[PDB]
Amino acid sequence: MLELLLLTSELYPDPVLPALSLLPHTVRTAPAEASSLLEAGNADAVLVDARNDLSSGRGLCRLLSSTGRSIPVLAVVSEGGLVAVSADWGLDEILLLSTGPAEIDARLRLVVGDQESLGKVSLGELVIDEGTYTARLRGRPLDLTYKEFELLKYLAQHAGRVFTRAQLLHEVWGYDFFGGTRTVDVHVRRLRAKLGPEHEALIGTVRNVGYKAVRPA
Amino acid sequence: MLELLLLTSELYPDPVLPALSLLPHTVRTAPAEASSLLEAGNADAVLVDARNDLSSGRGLCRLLSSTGRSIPVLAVVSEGGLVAVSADWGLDEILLLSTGPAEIDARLRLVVGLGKVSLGELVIDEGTYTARLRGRPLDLTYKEFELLKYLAQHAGRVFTRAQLLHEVWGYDFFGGTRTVDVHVRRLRAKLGPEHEALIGTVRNVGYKAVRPA
Amino acid sequence: MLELLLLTSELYPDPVLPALSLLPHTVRTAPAEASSLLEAGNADAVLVDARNDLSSGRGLCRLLSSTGRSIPVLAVVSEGGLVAVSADWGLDEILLLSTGPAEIDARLRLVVGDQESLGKVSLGELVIDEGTYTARLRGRPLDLTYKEFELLKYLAQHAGRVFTRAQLLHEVWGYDFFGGTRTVDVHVRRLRAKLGPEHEALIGTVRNVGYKAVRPA
Amino acid sequence: DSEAVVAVDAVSFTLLQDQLQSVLDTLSEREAGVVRLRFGLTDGQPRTLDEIGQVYGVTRERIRQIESKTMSKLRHPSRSQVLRDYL
């Protein structure tokens, strides 16, 4: 779910903060220098190995907690280095190396929960902003119908995925109108009326079975 | 963090499992069928009632099993019924009514916190519906991909068209169509002269996917 | 049933798992150290105690779950430390201290791998796997026609039963070609060849009745 | 006397034979006739699919197709639930 960067003099997320490996979160590694601050990106927390370097660790906190770094900044420290951790660090939270899995889970939901979007996916031109319930395809918005917008994303987030209309029936109609699924074909028209040839091929047809979504290249 | 589903006719989680009240993990209940797969949505755990009825729970776990990709499937029994608990149910854990709150919570965290494998010289991508063999490009459309995947997934399991209609097709079954023949020939031709011997025909019964080598 | 090496610096397994003496499992015991990693050998499953040392218990379960250790690993923990244990320790199953003996047997069977062989028919040295459709003899593939195999499996699956030609026609040559009994002998003549005399004892013939199979000693 | 009619079988045999009509007729009549001679129930001779071509004017492979069309749709439990009591 959430992306983390681990600033460290070590090579793996296991010795620095082991309970991130006890989590299904994704943690990348980096050296403990300022250029690794250019490696954060669209992450949600950045965790400095300050378990040995307390002065240089707090310096990396001060460069991380500067003016416009909206990713909430973290350090991992020993228990005899927590006495150095104060308001002059500029940290958001603190995490011991002995911290549990669900403990780091709740601390991450307190420090996270820069407003990283949840359901904002971008399939090339197809920029499906489900936070706004709008999909941009080649810039101009898609003024599909209410249930047309749903179908497009269900084909999009299942890129390359072929299904029979019955399976599509469960993800568009659900438990309603089981027979006479033809309108999906008409609804493909309602999709292509607002897509055009630039991406009219992005919805691949599958004769006798259904359709499919094509990944642009 | 999770929703738990109990396939039970007890209509209540605490007579089935007392500890489930002390955990804030919320539980929905459905009667003991396989059809209650339509009942579950974003629930990361589903449990099968097997406390009073053992073989019914074994059959419902058999129907609820590892197909894709897979959801955590649990089943609860008594202590003397622990002998029929085996791997053939389709499980990742076993629970009892004597299981506690921290015990249930930790086993749930074990199952939720694995990866499909598809190698025959033949890249298989269960979600991607992509195929490769002796080269990146091996165009597999839907009907032949799951088809071939079923064969490669069941390498050597002699398959007959009757067996494919209920798996590769839905199906009606619109059986006895010979469309497997043209489908397999495409699979034979598209896969090229090499790896064309994996999908071999065993007469009077159909085909089997010879393993490599 | 299982040769089990317990990882405890305590000498006895009964403070560790009190129900474990109640089963015929042979519990070798070795100190809670890395050097016990060399003493794995033919141990069915390894028992790592993390009832008390959860940090070094995590270390030992990581040690027994390294790149080439297929021996399944059990973390044996307290109830207030089960929530510290998850799939990060390289595990498939864990055991509490109040785990029952039938519960120990069940979870040990489940952590080892029950696993019954498919339609694997076995008649003396001739073992048939109808799945792959091989009536291999002592491991070498055997080459029958479509009918001989089904002829053979029927007798193989009904060894000892005295069948008749008229009887066997139905379940081998279906409902068709209803005449011409001697198709059996011409086929039997090939069966008795491609079986080899070393195991024609399996194939029995009684005059005036037909053919059968006999289980060898 | 080993040759005694259980007389539950006989009544139940009639019930088997009648559920057979009730199930076949609820199926298509072409298929009902196909099986009535394929198994040769109403007659003495079960038939092969190339005899059926004369009586039904179609290729034997098409009766191979129809045999599954019978069985699988039969293999919908609706037909099976009412017939599984017959054993």
Swiss-Prot record, chain D:
Triggers of expression: Constitutively expressed under all conditions tested except for 3-fold reduction in stationary phase, standing culture and upon growth in H(2)O. 2-fold induced by starvation. Half-life of over 40 minutes.
Endpoints of the signal sequence: none
Consequence of changing residue 75 to H: Loss of interaction with WhiB3
Region of interest called Sigma-70 factor domain-4, as start-end residue ranges on this chain: 23-76
Locations listed in the record: Cytoplasm
Portion annotated as DNA-binding: 49-68
Superkingdom assignment: Bacteria
Its biological purpose: Sigma factors are initiation factors that promote the attachment of RNA polymerase to specific initiation sites and are then released. This sigma factor is the primary sigma factor during exponential growth.
Assembly: Interacts transiently with the RNA polymerase catalytic core formed by RpoA, RpoB, RpoC and RpoZ (2 alpha, 1 beta, 1 beta' and 1 omega subunit) to form the RNA polymerase holoenzyme that can initiate transcription. Interacts with WhiB3 and probably with RbpA probably via its sigma-2 region.
Domain notes: The sigma-70 factor domain-2 mediates sequence-specific interaction with the -10 element in promoter DNA, and plays an important role in melting the double-stranded DNA and the formation of the transcription bubble. The sigma-70 factor domain-2 mediates interaction with the RNA polymerase subunits RpoB and RpoC. The sigma-70 factor domain-4 contains a helix-turn-helix (H-T-H) motif that mediates interaction with the -35 element in promoter DNA. The domain also mediates interaction with the RNA polymerase subunit RpoA.
Family: Belongs to the sigma-70 factor family. RpoD/SigA subfamily.
Other comments on record: Was identified as a high-confidence drug target.
Designated name of the protein: RNA polymerase sigma factor SigA
Protein species of origin: Mycobacterium tuberculosis (strain ATCC 25618 / H37Rv)
Protein encoded by which gene: sigA
